[PDB]
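Example complex used in Figure S2.
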Amino acid sequence: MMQISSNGITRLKREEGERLKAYSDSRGIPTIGVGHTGKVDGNSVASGMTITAEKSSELLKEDLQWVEDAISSLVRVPLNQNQYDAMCSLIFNIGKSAFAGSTVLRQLNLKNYQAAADAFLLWKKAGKDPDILLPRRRRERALFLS
Amino acid sequence: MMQISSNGITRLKREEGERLKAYSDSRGIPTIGVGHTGKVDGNSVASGMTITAEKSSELLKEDLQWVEDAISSLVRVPLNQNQYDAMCSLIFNIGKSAFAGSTVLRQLNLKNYQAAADAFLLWKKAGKDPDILLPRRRRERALFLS
Ligand SMILES: [Mg+2]
Ligand SMILES: [Sm+3]
Ligand SMILES: [Sm+3]
Ligand SMILES: [Sm+3]
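Predicted assembly (292 residues):
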């Protein structure tokens, strides 16, 4: 089955931000790497923990399994790697349920790939800002179409 | 049999670089994926060939057969999966002959595992820079000791 590429990982890290020192996120959840909140080598993330970029990649691939599974489950048409990598980035952000209900998905499964790419741009709001995710969506759309 | 793990493949792809569109290496050899120069789907690698990340990983797993075979034929002591994955990365780089004559091998076969790990750091020179591979060797050593 398909898998995220090295370029896909690099681009996703850029979009998400990578933090090699543990921190408490805006909700209070200990986090490290690229959004990793689960255990790291058998222990909970905690103040003072540091990891390498390569460990951060390892953890991110573990945390992307639900994303890759969702694409495998939901998408029934061919994807090139750039399309796949872009979708990984979108889905990692908006979540599986949002993607399952999305125009991106519906258009993809009709093989309207340009329309699916354009539908990335709908996923632009966060909180009280109607367009804060639009620059990310544009970069993902560009990758999808590349 | 022991074989490279998915973690081992990810880490090796990081060290080597992945190209999903065919290119000519610095010597002029058509290459794709992670150092693949043989045919892909029955055709010679050539300008215009594209592949997926899944393909790239499956090609790499097959291209590593000489590495896996070198470990089986030369290493006389047990290896855990992290050790194995780190060895694959070193050997894929320096080649079978270099590994056969190495301090890494000698120390490994004496069951001097820490000294074997440390001896990775000897394989640091390339061209006119005496340490340019040292960061890679340190990362592989860290994987070995993990
Ligand atoms: Mg063999
Ligand atoms: Sm396959
Ligand atoms: Sm899985
Ligand atoms: Sm705004």
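Chain B is about 55% helix and 5% strand. The helical segments of chain B are 6-16, 53-63, 65-74, 81-94, 96-100, 103-109, 113-119, 134-145.
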